[PDB]
Write a protein that binds this ligand. Structure first.
Ligand SMILES: C[N+](C)(C)CCOP(=O)(O)O
Ligand SMILES: C[N+](C)(C)CCOP(=O)(O)O
Ligand SMILES: C[N+](C)(C)CCOP(=O)(O)O
Ligand SMILES: C[N+](C)(C)CCOP(=O)(O)O
Ligand SMILES: C[N+](C)(C)CCOP(=O)(O)O
Ligand SMILES: C[N+](C)(C)CCOP(=O)(O)O
Lengths: 293, 293, 293, 293, 293, 293
């Protein structure tokens, strides 16, 4: 908070009384199904120390959630997006540097609750024959309650070096038709990994027995559209005013197969089965304030 | 957040010191009952890289929730809107591109709660005859609680390519007269799919035994009015400054029929029975900054 | 959100650097008790495509909650407002069109909660005579909880065509003196529809045995005052610059009667008994920017 | 609150009608994996008393969560980041002083709840043979409930002297696969410290039996990126207008080892095993308003 | 609220169209470990009645939480900060006066909940031999629940006279390792004051058996940094335009000692054992608008 | 809400394009310990109808919570602030009038919850000897829950006439060491009024057995600082332009005494024992726009 140090709010920010030349570059990768897009903005504040360039890799990455193989009614497979990644890199010989990046790791909290209860009890029982009975009792109880919120997909900022910074979205866990949350490492001795399972002991075809993509999370089938911001700073006295960047939009898929053993369906998951990578190289012209490729 | 990178807020946005020529086109499709409307805005910022055009397909799509067929008092049908869709497309030979789209897939969270309880107990019982008894006991308890929020209709952004982007609203589930949430795949061995069922064993006519549209969700009967935004960017050095777009407003209906078997009503649902499509082609004039059709 | 597409906020809105000529027309319908009022605003933005006119039918519609008929102490009636409606229409031969309307159908959500509990138990019992007993036990529990919020009156936007758009407010359900929520279709074999019932087996007069209007909802007795906005767009090259509109303020009442059968009061409801309609025709002068009637 | 003393809001803040010369210095420490960065801003308000300089050590510190040693399948180790630290210091002979620092210790609250319950009971039991029995009972209950929120990592502001100020982020506690929160001092007679333990009695290799970094907190593996602000004030009549600062980015790691004793895994933690320090010295030029190194 | 009296918001505030000369004075007390700082602002509004000066004693006071004495393994002591205080005073012969002070005593609320439950019960029991039994029962329950939030440290504004105003932060209560909240007056016949106790019957050294400062509150070890505002008003026609102020930063520590009696540790607390005071005198020059010392 | 009548927000407020001459008067009453202060503001808007003057009696009133009398170890007294009051009055012959006053009585709400539960039960019991038993049962439950929030002190606006307006803060109730809320009229046959009681049957001195002022509410010991606003309007054509006001800061104390009867302490409260009043008269000069005394 700028106002908590008694400084007038917005005083220390950069971008005042200057013209920024924005831009946009859109490209679609038919082979990998990644509608990648970057939104740049050249800021050169005289009161600042270095030339600035903020790059927002908005884009969109498809989900690719479908049944790839079926072998009769006995067994079938499924490929689902385990993780989405997008990273920017600079050549080792380059002079520009990575300064900031908005989406960053944040500390997560949890509730906690301790309970203690004392009790007392006493009743008098009687019947027709005149018998009279008594009872005196007491009890204690101690309880611990802990609650927290866990998303389906968890965004992470991989350790950013000076030249490359990258983000990552992984599959935390999912709830299958109101059943408890399942994850890639979940296992059951009878049924196995019941993550994308429709019915435990249905009589349908193996390929038919899979969770409806509408029922599952949206990111599995319709994909994940990132919104990540990074700023590159270049010294204004550098000999060479041209820079190259690489943008990658890799996606990792897993193999989920269920098998009809004797009576019930048994599901098995094989993590990190395929990876689809789409890298494109852009060129920066600091003198002309335009990035084109 | 722009202010989290120490950049002054609003610096990187586009639209400063320029005039935008907005517009409006309204058309009603009597056959399909779709009051479609698009709201465009031509933005040409000199500091930007490409000409811009944001299109907001506000419109409105009717619900069409009514009983289509009745066969005596034994059985009757019902057509209800399973899903609403609206998509924009560009010709394959076009030079413009789709850049951004506001409503996008978002990660959904869930609560979780673990409980543990220890107990102790002890009572002393006595009667008139001098008998004295005792009792010492203990207990343990482990509990898992998981809660989440689920809407009636779920909006989804279908994987947007470079030329076409489309949204989709599907029927997640509904609560029937305070009874548990039902969906298209819900089944009961006795009653069947009780989604749009008034009384389980009523003596009324089959056509009369259907849930009141007022009781059900508003989108089923009065329809769904979208609000979706997309921006098309065209290079300012292109030879041809005219572009064509197609806007579709398709709606998918399902067939819900209940049948009087012997004593109780039995309901059956047939998903994706009908689809109504309304496509209109617009023309863009970048040089004159007007879209007309 | 305009700022989520990287466009500067408020850029695409219409109404900048222009003068809007507002207005007001107030009329009271003594026969129907409807204090109707419309608030118009003529916006002609040069950068826009069509002339604009936003109409806000604020007004007010009375409730008319009273006992209409009494027949001795054995039976009596009651008329209460089941639904309030207000709709605007344009002639079929007109050239103007309906573009937008603020209050629109919205998707409604619901909570859901699944619980699972394991238990264990064990006690040792002894008495004076040296008898020693034991007990070991366990238990399981599964629970489903679903909660949602339901208003007394539910506003709905009837499917708007190109020429007419109308809203609707209906009676969802009401709580009678802390008793469970009742609605028009509620039925009890003994008492019947206990919606507006004071005492189940009171000895008072039939007309006296009705729920106090203060206890019931405010809209039943003091009426409902709408606030609905609609915008009409007219091409600026049209030959005729005069337009006519019709505004209707219809209200629907139901007949609730309770009858003393032998020991207890029995209540019956007859939906859609009366309708009061108040239609007024206004004239629009686009050239002079004034609506008068 | 400035407005609560009847002073106009923002009147007492500093930074009005002046130009601030910001800056940026980025450096990466390959040996320690610390992407350190500082963002300075020189404010010289004529109406103020001293020259100002606010330093924001944004940077980023990696996590370094990995298995360092394995000795067969019997035992293996693990190094995880116990605490992250970042501190600024001034030479003892310097004339500048540390004035303010935004992130500061805050008081933490807790809920509390007291419950009291009275009860009464009575039943009548009878059988075929005409025996009639009775029972009258009562009970009391007293309960205390206390709940609070505890984060995984806790940021602390070490006692700031005139010359040096430093912050600190420590490992409060973590939840292991829905099991109760564990910390460095947690101990179990059978299993030991089960903090980073996958399975209690798994048959896998010792190195394989460790909690997945994705399952654990993000700061453990992907590191912690600070955002801390400090302002240095220098008298404007000082003879020497040059100042030196030191910035340290130390990180402390702990040694977690699990051992297979006879049947189950036993985990042991050794706090404060390694510390990685990265100190860099900057030079301040108040006359030229630039910090360079 | 200014707008609730129909006055335009901000009209009655002071500070419009004037220049305020702020300032800063920083001093560190090595002996007492108090980094004291004051931030003044001279406001002389012509439309106001008196010259103004708002003083913000931001500063910082250390915690000083450490074991001062140990006597073998049998007993040891501990000094912890019981309360932090900061107060401003004016000479009795002075002409200036204290007008306002932002942090002030506020009324605290509490929840309350009353519950009432009626019950009924009935079961039929039978066995093989044809015996039939019955049971009819009922119960009542009354419950009172009261919940409130209590912080660890409680800030208080001591009764401000015309010449001196002072604040105070005291130790309300603390939770020790999830155990119930303890305070200075808490007592247990067996263990005593278990406030800063690690293990009830540990075998470690007495000095070692103390709560980790990280586990305890942050203010105990890293200290408390105040933020308090006060405004001094001086008549503009006074003969003498120079004023003196005194600022005190006293801190009170308590003595917590645990003793190994025979089997378990016993803890005793001695409140108000030491007080550290740091008073500095400043001089105000109203004519020159500067406070220096 | 100004914007809900379609009027532009802030249009109807008063204070536009005018200069307000504020002021401040501070006085301390050593005898009664009341640091009273008033903050006036003269507003004369030409577009308004009357001259305005808003008076804010900020001030501060001490608590005066102390033991006044002790008689050995058998009994002792206590004086605590039961209520704080502050009121303004005008002479009966004056021409000015009281117009508005911000803190005003507000309606308070409460939650309510009705619960209904149905149950069913059935178990089968068997033993070694072949005996088989059964049991079928059911139960019902009805519950009413009502919760609300109640502060320790309750501010009230006494009925304001044309010449005088006054506020009042009373002692609603307090929680004594986690025990149920007690008030002045609370009574117990054994212990009596246990409001400010330390221990029920402690062996300490009577004067020592009183609740610590830190444990009790802050307003009891450190006092209550009001913030109340009132505006006085005077006709601009009046013959006499001078007005007199009276400001009172009365405080009411109660006598709480506990007595050692035979085994336990018994507490008694005597409401409205003392009242301390501090009235000061101010003079208003409308022509010169200054209030001085
Ligand atoms: C896991 N489960 C499907 C057996 C029960 C579902 O309840 P929960 O475990 O999600 O609380
Ligand atoms: C599903 N049901 C109608 C039997 C019970 C309703 O309760 P719930 O299942 O919605 O919690
Ligand atoms: C419906 N009722 C009047 C029998 C009980 C009221 O409780 P609820 O049904 O509103 O929870
Ligand atoms: C600690 N535990 C793993 C035995 C139980 C988990 O429940 P909780 O202790 O987190 O409430
Ligand atoms: C006080 N205690 C440690 C015995 C129990 C903890 O529970 P609580 O008293 O904080 O609710
Ligand atoms: C009143 N009491 C001290 C006996 C019990 C405290 O619980 P509560 O009455 O505040 O809920």
């Amino acid at each position: 908070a700028d106002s908590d140090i008694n400084i007038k709010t917005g005083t220390t920010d950069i971008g005042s009384n200057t013209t920024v030349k924005t831009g946009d570059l859109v490209t679609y990768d038919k082979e990998n199904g990644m509608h990648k897009k970057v939104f740049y903005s050249f800021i050169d504040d005289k009161n600042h120390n270095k030339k600035l360039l903020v790059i927002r890799t908005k884009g969109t990455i498809a989900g690719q959630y479908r049944v790839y193989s079926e072998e009769g009614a006995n067994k079938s497979g499924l490929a689902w997006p385990s993780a989405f990644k997008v990273q920017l890199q600079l050549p080792d010989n380059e002079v520009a540097q990575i300064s900031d990046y908005y989406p960053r790791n944040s500390i997560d909290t949890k509730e906690y609750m301790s309970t203690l209860t004392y009790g007392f009890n006493g009743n008098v029982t009687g019947d027709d024959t005149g018998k009279i009975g008594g009872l005196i009792g007491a009890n204690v109880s101690i309880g611990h309650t802990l609650k927290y919120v866990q998303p389906d997909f968890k965004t992470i900022l991989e350790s950013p070096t000076d030249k490359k910074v990258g983000w990552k979205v992984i599959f935390n866990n999912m709830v299958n038709q109101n059943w408890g949350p399942y994850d890639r490492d979940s296992w059951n001795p009878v049924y196995g990994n019941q993550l994308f399972m429709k019915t435990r002991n249905g009589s349908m075809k193996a390929a038919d027995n899979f969770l409806d993509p509408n029922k599952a999370s949206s990111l599995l089938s319709s994909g994940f559209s990132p919104d990540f911001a990074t700023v590159i700073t270049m010294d204004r006295k550098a000999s060479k005013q041209q820079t190259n960047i690489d943008v990658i939009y890799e996606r990792v898929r897993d193999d989920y197969q269920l098998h009809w053993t004797s009576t019930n369906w048994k599901g098995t998951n094989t993590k990190d089965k395929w990876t689809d990578r789409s890298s494109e190289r852009y060129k920066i012209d600091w003198e002309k304030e335009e990035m084109t490729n």
